[PDB]
Design a protein around this nucleic acid. Structure first.
Ligand SMILES: [Mg+2]
Ligand SMILES: [Mg+2]
Ligand SMILES: [Mg+2]
Ligand SMILES: [Mg+2]
Ligand SMILES: [Mg+2]
Ligand SMILES: [Mg+2]
Ligand SMILES: [Mg+2]
Ligand SMILES: [Mg+2]
Ligand SMILES: [Mg+2]
Ligand SMILES: [Mg+2]
Ligand SMILES: [Mg+2]
Ligand SMILES: [Mg+2]
Ligand SMILES: [Mg+2]
Lengths: 153, 61, 63, 60, 107, 50, 354
RNA sequence: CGCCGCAGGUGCAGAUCUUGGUGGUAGUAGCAAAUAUUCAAACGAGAACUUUGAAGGCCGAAGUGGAGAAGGGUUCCAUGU
């Protein structure tokens, strides 16, 4: 299917993709930027640490109201969080990409996340009930994710 | 093995009513087989017998 | 797995409340097999379902 | 247990069962189902067995 | 060895100090579980039901000041689990807590 | 209510019977264009006319 | 783990007498089946002879159960198999020259011995049977000889299937679509290891790949039609049922519970027949089958004017040679065909004997 | 579609314009009325919330109990997802 940023050579690369994944787009975009360029082993260890709240993702663009943490100093930042659902969804996509690499026959101990992108999926509509007989939206903000891993050691 | 209007027309009221009764007991048996599973052949005979009853009653009337 | 039906049936058979129905925590699979009031009666006879005693409200202090 | 026409009453149900099954019946209870079909519980006479009558009907 | 068992006494009063009334007994079991993780070094800590009944014995806010427990590190016997060992903490009824040391105990 | 007339009960019977999904073989008919029963009614969402 | 295998001498000998008792009752059936006989009468006498023979056998040990592993199934000229009428069902009289398909199984100590054979009743002396019927029985027997030769540990279960398809194409006929042979062990008739006959897309992708293994029994089945191989039902009561011990359900019917207990007492897991009871039996069976405690063995009809033949038999797989315990009386001298086999590989397998 | 004529419901930034879609706000306000949960186990890919057992509590008979009228109309009951 059409990925943006097709790999430089599609022989040492593997792809993974998800659509209409019900995670917050803003949280997943920050998590994806954190693991971008990481080795696949480093990214798996880091994403598990985010779930355990031992390492945080820095919230750089979608940081309105995001609190401060000591682990954001690892990055050059001040605000960070531990999006558990984003980390789990990216761990599933990393396992899928890793299995795809084995199907292509290329070793997975040298894979590096060279491309990762979070797009906005179509919104899902729910309702909330307000003070004077009014209805306001309760939209979900799902996201598409695509990633490309390429070998380099 | 079917019934047609043209060869029903020479018959008398008694044997027309008897043929109506036999079709009615068969239709009731088919409705029994419908609610007890039955078979596709038995289910498809329901329309055939229903049209036969209409055919006899039309000729009678 | 889920014994919501069996607790309800046992309380009706035993003519007590669901408070007083004791289903054996170890014989969960056997009790889950009971989907009829007569099966419930068999488990009650076999001791897998027990009617618990009334919580004590003594009148000794009042007397 | 039969599904019957919603217009038929207990007397008509009693006579209809007696004729087209050649059995004697004791009493007929009748309700109308939530989907609109009338249902008749036709108790048979003591000397008639509902088991083998349902066998010759074909609904066993 | 890693199948060691030891008897401890925990100052519940020390670890519960300052907690609100409706949280005192729930926090006592969180502190008992945290105590067992520290002393035996196993994330998998299983509170015995007698021990839970002892902590809640006087209600939700009047938790006992001291409790005498026994930690038993044992093999998980489920190698499919990520933990090789778990600590089973049980309740040791005592008449007094004076002069009670942490003691290694036999089987 | 428990107390109901025969007309009310018969009206409720028809409303119940037509509150079912479309058969799956409808979707394979030539020139179908029908996806699902758009006249589905839930008892809590939309109240009946009567 | 607790299953009993054929490595023991006593298990070997009781298979030999299990197929011996199966062969003599099938032989008695073939001789007794003639013009003007009742299928119900054949089923009851074939069953009765089994009961008295399996009762008088091993008079010094009266503890282990013995009995029927599959009821006598007599299907004639319009039914595929799994056919055994009750007393209420109208009988079938045997006309002249009818081809009949007889199925029969008997189990000892839980191990079964299943035999089946197709033959034509009342073969006149000095005549030769000719027609489109001539090829279907002969090709089916050539399938039995082929499977007898090629049953061996290492010959895959698929090689059985396309071999039967090949000889069927040689005779310009087709087998019945999706018929199922089984691998047999103790106290089962529906083992997971299975052989499909004349598959399609659905069957081939739900079927499994397996390699023949030593010390196990094979109830292999050839079943070929002279038409299209398709089958359905025509509103006929299903009689043969078998208890599935995998699942259970709380029966809410007193008559169904009594019927299910009698099934467990007599035919605990092997298939049975409704003739072995009747008024209450046909009452309890439906509410047992509704919750899938009994698996129905429905009757299958082809179109009118078609003729279908079958053979099946249990072959023990023993390393240095497999032996056919149960065999049917087929003689090619009194039965010819208008088309033959023209493949050299088929010539090689028939000429080489085990 | 060009050219010669003919004819218009013929040119948009506005109208607190109409309909549709989308932003910043913003991962923000918020998910704070009626005291309260805890331990173990089972099923399950997954358990703060399901089920069972054990505790500790609440409603406290003018009940958070057991039944009805009106109204609802299948919400009842099993099984499965
Ligand atoms: Mg701000
Ligand atoms: Mg704030
Ligand atoms: Mg609101
Ligand atoms: Mg309002
Ligand atoms: Mg009434
Ligand atoms: Mg409302
Ligand atoms: Mg205009
Ligand atoms: Mg505009
Ligand atoms: Mg907030
Ligand atoms: Mg709040
Ligand atoms: Mg109180
Ligand atoms: Mg009330
Ligand atoms: Mg409900």
């Amino acid at each position: 299917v059409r990925y943006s940023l097709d790999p430089e050579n599609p022989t040492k690369s593997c792809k993974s993709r998800g659509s209409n994944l019900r995670v917050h787009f803003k949280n997943t975009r920050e998590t994806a930027q954190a693991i971008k360029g990481m080795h696949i082993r480093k990214a798996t260890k880091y994403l598990k640490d985010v779930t355990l709240q031992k390492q945080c993702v820095p919230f750089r663009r979608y940081n309105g109201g995001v609190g401060r943490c000591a682990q954001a100093k690892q990055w050059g930042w001040t605000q960070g969080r531990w999006p558990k659902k984003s980390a789990e969804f990216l761990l599933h996509m990393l396992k899928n990409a890793e299995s795809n690499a084995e199907l292509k026959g290329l070793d997975v101990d040298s894979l590096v996340i060279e491309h990762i992108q979070v797009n906005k999926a179509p919104k899902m509509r729910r309702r909330t009930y307000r003070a004077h007989g009014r209805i306001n939206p309760y939209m979900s903000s799902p996201c598409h994710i695509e990633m490309i891993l390429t070998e380099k050691e | 093995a079917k019934i047609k209007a043209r060869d029903l027309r020479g018959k008398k009221k008694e044997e027309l009513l008897k043929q109506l009764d036999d079709l009615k007991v068969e239709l009731s048996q088919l409705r029994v087989a419908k609610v007890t599973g039955g078979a596709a052949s038995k289910l498809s005979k329901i329309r055939v017998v229903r049209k036969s009853i209409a055919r006899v009653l039309t000729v009678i009337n | 797995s889920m014994l919501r039906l069996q607790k309800r049936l046992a309380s009706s058979v035993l003519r007590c409340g669901k408070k007083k129905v004791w289903l054996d925590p170890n014989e969960t699979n056997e009790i889950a097999n009971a989907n009829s009031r007569q099966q419930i009666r068999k488990l009650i006879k076999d001791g897998l379902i027990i009617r618990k005693p009334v919580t004590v409200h003594s009148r000794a202090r009042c007397r | 247990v039969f599904i019957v026409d919603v217009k038929a009453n207990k007397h008509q149900i009693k006579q209809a069962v007696k004729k087209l099954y050649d059995i004697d019946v004791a009493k007929v209870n009748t309700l109308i189902r939530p989907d609109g079909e009338k249902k008749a519980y036709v108790r048979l006479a003591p000397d008639y067995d509902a088991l083998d009558v349902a066998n010759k009907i074909g609904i066993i | 060895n890693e199948v060691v068992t030891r008897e401890y006494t925990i100052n519940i009063h020390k670890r519960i100090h300052g907690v609100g009334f409706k949280k005192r007994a729930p926090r006592a079991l969180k502190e008992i579980r945290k105590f067992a993780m520290k002393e035996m070094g196993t994330p998998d800590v299983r509170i015995d039901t007698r021990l839970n009944k002892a902590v809640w014995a006087k209600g939700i806010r009047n938790v006992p000041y001291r409790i005498r427990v026994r930690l038993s590190r044992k093999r998980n016997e489920d190698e499919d689990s990520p933990n090789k060992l778990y600590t089973l903490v049980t309740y040791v009824p005592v008449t007094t807590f004076k002069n009670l040391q942490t003691v290694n105990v036999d089987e | 209510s428990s107390h109901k007339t025969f007309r009310i009960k018969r009206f409720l019977a028809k409303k119940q019977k037509q509150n079912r999904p479309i058969p799956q073989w409808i979707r394979m008919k030539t020139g179908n264009k029908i996806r699902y029963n758009s006249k589905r009614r839930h008892w809590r969402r939309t109240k009946l006319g009567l | 783990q607790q299953e009993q295998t054929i490595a023991e001498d006593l298990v070997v000998t009781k298979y030999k007498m299990g197929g011996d008792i199966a062969n003599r009752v099938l032989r008695s059936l073939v001789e007794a089946s003639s013009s003007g006989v009742s299928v119900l009468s054949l089923c009851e006498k074939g069953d009765a002879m089994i009961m008295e023979e399996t009762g008088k056998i091993f008079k010094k040990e009266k503890e282990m159960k013995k009995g029927i592993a599959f009821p006598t199934s007599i299907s004639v000229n319009n039914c595929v198999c799994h056919f055994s009428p009750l007393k209420s069902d109208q009988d079938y009289i045997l006309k002249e020259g009818d081809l009949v398909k007889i199925d029969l199984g008997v189990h000892v100590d839980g191990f079964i011995a299943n035999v089946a054979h197709t033959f034509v009743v009342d073969v006149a002396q000095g005549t030769q049977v000719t027609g489109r019927k001539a090829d279907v029985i002969k090709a089916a027997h050539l399938c039995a000889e082929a499977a007898l030769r090629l049953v061996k540990p290492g010959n895959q279960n698929t090689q059985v299937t396309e071999a039967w398809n090949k000889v069927a194409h040689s005779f310009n006929c087709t087998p019945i679509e999706g018929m199922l042979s089984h691998q047999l062990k103790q106290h089962v008739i529906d083992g997971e290891k299975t052989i499909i006959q004349n598959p399609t897309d659905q069957q081939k992708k739900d079927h499994e790949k397996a390699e023949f293994e030593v010390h196990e029994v094979y109830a292999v089945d050839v079943l070929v039609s002279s038409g299209e191989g398709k089958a359905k039902d025509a509103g006929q009561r299903t009689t043969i049922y078998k208890r599935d011990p995998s699942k259970q359900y709380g029966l809410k019917m007193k008559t169904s519970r009594a019927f299910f207990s009698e099934v467990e007492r007599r035919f605990d897991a092997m298939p049975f027949t409704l003739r072995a009871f009747e008024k209450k039996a046909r009452m309890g069976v439906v509410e047992c089958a509704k919750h899938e405690l009994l698996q129905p063995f429905n009757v299958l009809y082809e179109k009118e004017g078609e003729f279908v033949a079958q053979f099946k038999f249990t072959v023990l797989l023993m390393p240095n040679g497999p032996m056919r315990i149960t065999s049917g009386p087929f003689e090619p001298d009194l039965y010819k065909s208008e088309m033959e086999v023209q493949d050299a590989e088929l010539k090689a397998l028939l000429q080489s004997s085990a």
